[PDB]
Curated annotation (Swiss-Prot), chain A:
Gene that specifies this protein: sigA
Domain text: Contains 4 domains, connected by flexible linkers. In the active conformation, the domains are in an extended conformation, each making extensive interactions with the RNA polymerase catalytic core. In the autoinhibited state, sigma-70 factor domain-1 packs closely together with sigma-70 factor domains-2 and -4, contrary to the extended conformation that is seen when the protein is part of the RNA polymerase holoenzyme.
Annotated protein name in UniProt: RNA polymerase sigma factor SigA
Compartments reported by the entry: Cytoplasm
Lineage start: Bacteria, Thermotogati, Deinococcota, Deinococci, Thermales
Organism: Thermus thermophilus (strain ATCC BAA-163 / DSM 7039 / HB27)
The family this protein is said to belong to: Belongs to the sigma-70 factor family. RpoD/SigA subfamily.
Annotated region (Sigma-70 factor domain-1), positions in chain: 1-28
Its job: Sigma factors are initiation factors that promote the attachment of RNA polymerase to specific initiation sites and are then released. This sigma factor is the primary sigma factor during exponential growth.
Quaternary structure and interacting proteins, as annotated: Interacts transiently with the RNA polymerase catalytic core formed by RpoA, RpoB, RpoC and RpoZ (2 alpha, 1 beta, 1 beta' and 1 omega subunit) to form the RNA polymerase holoenzyme that can initiate transcription.
From Swiss-Prot, chain B:
Purpose of the protein: DNA-dependent RNA polymerase catalyzes the transcription of DNA into RNA using the four ribonucleoside triphosphates as substrates.
Name of the protein in its database record: DNA-directed RNA polymerase subunit beta'
Protein family membership: Belongs to the RNA polymerase beta' chain family.
Signal peptide bounds: none
Gene: rpoC
Lineage top rank: taxon: Bacteria
Assembly with partners or alone: The RNAP catalytic core consists of 2 alpha, 1 beta, 1 beta' and 1 omega subunit. When a sigma factor is associated with the core the holoenzyme is formed, which can initiate transcription.
RNA sequence: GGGG
DNA sequence: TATAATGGGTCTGATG
DNA sequence: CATCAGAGCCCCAAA
C-alpha cells in the first residue's frame, strides 16, 4: 500500500530526476575541488540537510563523525562561497 | 515560442489630406484615413521581398541582393504583389481602402514626414516581435524561464 | 500408533 | 553493469 | 463481545 502512494514516473520526469542526480554528482566533484574537502564527506552533509535532522550518524568510510555540530560547520563553510561557487 | 525583437526603419506614402499627424503611433492607432482607394506605388526598382506579419506586412525591394527600399503596409493595405516579383518604379504595390492603422503587435518609435505635392512619405522607426515556435522533446530540458529576455546565441533548451 |  | 520490464499467494473460563 | 491460555501420568518402538 505504501509503495502505491508514490506515482510512477513519466518518461520526462524519469529523465529529469536521473539528470538532476547526475548533475548533483558532478556538483560534488567540482565542490570538493573548490573547498578542498573530501567528496564523500561533502555528499553526506548534503544528504543530512535534505533528509532532515531525523538521520545523523557516523558514516564508516568518512573520517569526521557526523554530529549536528560538524555538519553545521560544513554547511557554513559551504554557504561561505561566492555566488558562482 | 520566442517573440524575437526586431527594430528597423521603413517608409510609406499617403495622401497628405488622408494622413493624421503624430510624432509616433502606438499599436492599433489610426495612421491615416483615405476618402477613396489610393494605390501605394513603388519608388525603386527591384525584386520583391514580402514578409507578412499577423496583420499588416513588410515589403523589401532589392537589386542583386542589396536592399534598396523598405516599405510598410499597415492594416487596410492589401498587397497587390507576391514574393520574388519584379517591380518597375511607379507600379502599384498595395491598395489602401479607407481607414488604415498600425497592427497590434508593432509600434512606431520616431516618425519623420517629408511633404511632396499632395502626399507625405513617412520614415517610421518601427519595432515589433516575430514569434518562432520550437518543439521540445522528452530527452531535452528547458533552461529558460517565462519572460526571460535572451540575447543572440543564448541557450533556451 | 501400542502398554498400564 | 544498459531492449523493456513498476502492488503477493473444540471448549471452557477469565479479562478489556 | 473479542483474545488469550488452559486442557492427567509414566513407558515402548519408530524416526
Amino acid at each position: 500500500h505504501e509503495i502505491g502512494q508514490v506515482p510512477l514516473l513519466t518518461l520526462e520526469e524519469e529523465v529529469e530526476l536521473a539528470r538532476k542526480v547526475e548533475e548533483g554528482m558532478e556538483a560534488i566533484k567540482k565542490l570538493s575541488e573548490i573547498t578542498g574537502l573530501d567528496p564523500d564527506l561533502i555528499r553526506e552533509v548534503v544528504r543530512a540537510k535534505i533528509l532532515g535532522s531525523a538521520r545523523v550518524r557516523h558514516i564508516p568510510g568518512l573520517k569526521e563523525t557526523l554530529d549536528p555540530k560538524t555538519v553545521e560547520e560544513i554547511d557554513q563553510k559551504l554557504k561561505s562561497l561566492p555566488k558562482e561557487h | 515560442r520566442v517573440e524575437y525583437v526586431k527594430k528597423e526603419r521603413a517608409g510609406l506614402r499617403l495622401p497628405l489630406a488622408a494622413w493624421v499627424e503624430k510624432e509616433a503611433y502606438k499599436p492599433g492607432e489610426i495612421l491615416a484615413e483615405l476618402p477613396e482607394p489610393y494605390l501605394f506605388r513603388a519608388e525603386e526598382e527591384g525584386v520583391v521581398e514580402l514578409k507578412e506579419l499577423e496583420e499588416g506586412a513588410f515589403l523589401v525591394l532589392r537589386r542583386e541582393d542589396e536592399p534598396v527600399a523598405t516599405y510598410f503596409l499597415p492594416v487596410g493595405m492589401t498587397p497587390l504583389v507576391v514574393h520574388g516579383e519584379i517591380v518597375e518604379k511607379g507600379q502599384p504595390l498595395a491598395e489602401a481602402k479607407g481607414l488604415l492603422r498600425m497592427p497590434r503587435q508593432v509600434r512606431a518609435a520616431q516618425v519623420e514626414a517629408e511633404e511632396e505635392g499632395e502626399t507625405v512619405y513617412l520614415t517610421l522607426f518601427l519595432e515589433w516581435t516575430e514569434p518562432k515556435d520550437y518543439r521540445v522533446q522528452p530527452h531535452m530540458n528547458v533552461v529558460v524561464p517565462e519572460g526571460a529576455r535572451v540575447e543572440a546565441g543564448d541557450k533556451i533548451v
